[PDB]
Design a protein around this ligand. Sequence first.
Ligand SMILES: [Cl-]
Ligand SMILES: [Cl-]
Ligand SMILES: [Cl-]
Ligand SMILES: [Cl-]
Ligand SMILES: [Cl-]
Ligand SMILES: [Cl-]
Lengths: 135, 133, 131, 133
Amino acid sequence: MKTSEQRVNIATLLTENKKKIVDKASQDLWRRHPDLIAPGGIAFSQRDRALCLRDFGWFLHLITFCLLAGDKGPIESIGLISIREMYNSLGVPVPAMMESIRCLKEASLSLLDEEDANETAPYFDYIIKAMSHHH
Amino acid sequence: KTSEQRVNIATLLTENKKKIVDKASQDLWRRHPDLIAPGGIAFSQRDRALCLRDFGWFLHLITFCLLAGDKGPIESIGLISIREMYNSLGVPVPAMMESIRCLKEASLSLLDEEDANETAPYFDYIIKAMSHH
Amino acid sequence: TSEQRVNIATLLTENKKKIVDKASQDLWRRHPDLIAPGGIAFSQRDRALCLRDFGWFLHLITFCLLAGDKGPIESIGLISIREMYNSLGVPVPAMMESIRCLKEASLSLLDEEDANETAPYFDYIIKAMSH
Amino acid sequence: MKTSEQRVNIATLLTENKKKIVDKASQDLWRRHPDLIAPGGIAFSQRDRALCLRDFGWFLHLITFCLLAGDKGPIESIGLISIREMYNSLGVPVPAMMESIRCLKEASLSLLDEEDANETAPYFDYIIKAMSH
Ligand SMILES: [Cl-]
Ligand SMILES: [Cl-]
Ligand SMILES: [Cl-]
Ligand SMILES: [Cl-]
Ligand SMILES: [Cl-]
Ligand SMILES: [Cl-]
């Protein structure tokens, strides 16, 4: 394997448990802020909206792609700027995006062993910092 | 041999299950976000909020009643057992009633006027069953 | 029968996804051409089975379980369901096989006493979907 | 991509119709090779397996990420090589991966307007070439 085996394994494990991770994460946010995450009937492209499960899955895939790519900042990639821009135009609140990704972190890291969690936590942090304040 | 109208209405509701359940759940959620949670929740969990699975359960139930011609006033054995199931789940009565009201509006909006008039009683039957004592 | 039945129905309902995945995959391994991936318009005439058909039938068997309806008399609902699928042009052999797969998947999760209680309700629906 | 807004909109549109695209794509493959795509979920980590819906959604997100990033080769990104490697170890055939991505292409492009399809097609081609060694 050219690419890191650790990374490939972490990515396959996150991919395999996508549903479990997204349920745990969304439910965790919902318990605390029920008004920020709707159960269905929101179009991803709808301006000025609450979170939906699709945002949770988007971000999970994104963090996995970064993990595989070794991209964890400090330089924000072109892709990551375009994502921020996409969400910018969607009008999805910054505090809520940050909180969704924090919930995915806790959900994802709980499934990993300690060495893998330590390796993976920075990639969540990268994406949380990226999706923050205004720009 | 059995009502073609009813079979057609049931097919149409079954086909648009996702669309109906999204609309219905979102409708309830906009008004009472704390009563309907995202994603999968253990259906058997006592003292819980609603999940999408409850919306789909009830839709299938109303469809089965429609197919069976069962719209009260006498409550079937099945329907009493369903109420009982939910009774033990500790799911609030007002919230169950409201979930089924939202499915009604969502389902009837897809039907033409004659079919809506035919189908509305089956929702009312279930809404009344799930409001007990 | 009442509390046992309610509990079995709750348990089947709770494990709907797990049951439907197991059942569909079981059919698919043996007859891949009879069950397609993802969502298909339910009303589309002359189609393959989809996961939604598996979930429909599971809910149906659960309703029968709750109602105590296991034949020999076929309920009007059950005849109308057969009719619905009849017009959809889903093959009879494939429907029967889908329900057999749900049986095996559902019964494997139950303890032996509950499996014995529940098996007849699957058999009822399989016989019903066969004319 | 004419404007950066066009790209953002195409990415939003692909994301929004993920389910519709993945159903169409998987069904398209399935009609031709039913033994290569199983229904409703397989353990993603299982060695020597058939395709599942999760593979279709993975690749769609990947093509969207490339679209947003402006990455359409010819040079393969590190991430893209790692993805190929991931699948390599999963024992999923090269011909089947290529075919899945071709199906997503046709499914995704059919939902776009013709101008947007012309813009988007290169990103699919990039990923198809990448998944071929
Ligand atoms: Cl908080
Ligand atoms: Cl709200
Ligand atoms: Cl009236
Ligand atoms: Cl048709
Ligand atoms: Cl996916
Ligand atoms: Cl145009």
